[PDB]
Amino acid sequence: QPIFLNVLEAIEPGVVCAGHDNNQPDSFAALLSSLNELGERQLVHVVKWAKALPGFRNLHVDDQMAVIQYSWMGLMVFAMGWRSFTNVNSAMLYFAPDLVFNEYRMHKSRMYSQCVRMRHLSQEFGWLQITPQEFLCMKALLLFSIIPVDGLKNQKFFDELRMNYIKELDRIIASCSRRFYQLTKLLDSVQPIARELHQFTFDLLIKSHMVSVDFPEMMAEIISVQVPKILSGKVKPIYFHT
């Protein structure tokens, strides 16, 4: 319909596999190493997605990387939750076609609770009958949903961008307002999830030698330089609802 929807559809990243060896048995080290690797792979695509987003180049260059660097966990969880929805109706987590988590992997990854949280999120796409277009605008909005408490290098450009992505979400919803409450509530629910994964990946990186869980270059860096900013409270999500 609009140029906006056109673009989100056009730029939506395709299939990313994890490289996981599905012949080897399930083990914390194998699974988490494959996850970390899927993380690196998807990071590459999120950067490119983000950069091709309407209005994105309005942001100051510093803010362009910051915003991505802070929001990846949520975008990735969110996108994954939708894959898990469309591909398997939320019965398992469809991280990638070569890394689908059944309950046994949920428990073997040592992230069962976090996993059940994501499965639930995935179910929400069903329970609310989220349209493919609702999904894409929502995921777009997620990128503008976490920021330093100090604001950004150029706070005004960000606010404008964030304002218009809200407007678009609203235009594509357009009592019809329970809809908006719900979706905004759905969006807020990504954040407590991402915070758990944040603490978890961080702890994991710290003891990563002691468990033989393997971290790739870009993952290690972001998790040690950027993720701690979030957990120390220097960077916080923007919630719709208090």
Ligand X SMILES: Nc1cc(N2CCCCC2)nc(N)[n+]1[O-]
Ligand Y SMILES: C[C@]12CCC(=O)C[C@@H]1CC[C@@H]1[C@@H]2CC[C@]2(C)[C@@H](O)CC[C@@H]12
Closest residue to bound ligand Y by CB: 39
Q: List the structure tokens of 41.
A: 């792979």
> Tokens 């083990």 correspond to what residue?
27
3-state secondary structure of 62: helix
Question: Does residue 128 belong to the site contacting ligand X (CB under 6 A)?
Answer: yes
Give every CB contact of residue 143 below 8 A, 6+ residues apart in sequence: 50, 53, 67, 68, 71, 75
Q: Given candidates 155, 182, 200, 202, which one binds ligand X under the rule CB under 6 A?
A: 182
Q: Using DSSP, state whether 240 is helix, strand or coil.
A: coil
Does 134 engage in binding with ligand X (CB under 6 A)? no
- Tell me the number of residues near ligand X by CB under 6 A: 5
Q: Which of 37, 40, 63, 124 binds ligand X (CB under 6 A)?
A: 124
Question: Could you give the CA distance from residue 77 to residue 73 in angstroms, rounded to a whole number?
Answer: 6
Task: Give min distance, CB of 24 to ligand X, in A.
Answer: 37
Cite the annotated binding site for 17beta-hydroxy-5alpha-androstan-3-one by residue number: 36, 83, 201
Closer by beta carbon to ligand X, 128 or else 211 = 128
Binding of residue 218 to ligand X (CB under 6 A): no
Q: Which residues contact 192 (CB under 8 A, 6 or more apart)?
A: 117
Q: Which residues bind ligand Y (CB under 6 A)?
A: 32, 35-36, 38-39, 42, 73, 76-77, 80, 95, 197, 200-201, 204
Task: Kindly state the DSSP code that residue 58 receives in the 8-state scheme.
Answer: G
Nearer to ligand Y among residue 43 and residue 137 (C-beta): 43
Residue nearest to ligand X (CB): 127
As measured in angstroms, the least distance from the Cβ of 189 to ligand X is 8
Radius of gyration of the chain (CA): 17
Binding site for ligand X (CB under 6 A): 124, 127-128, 182, 185
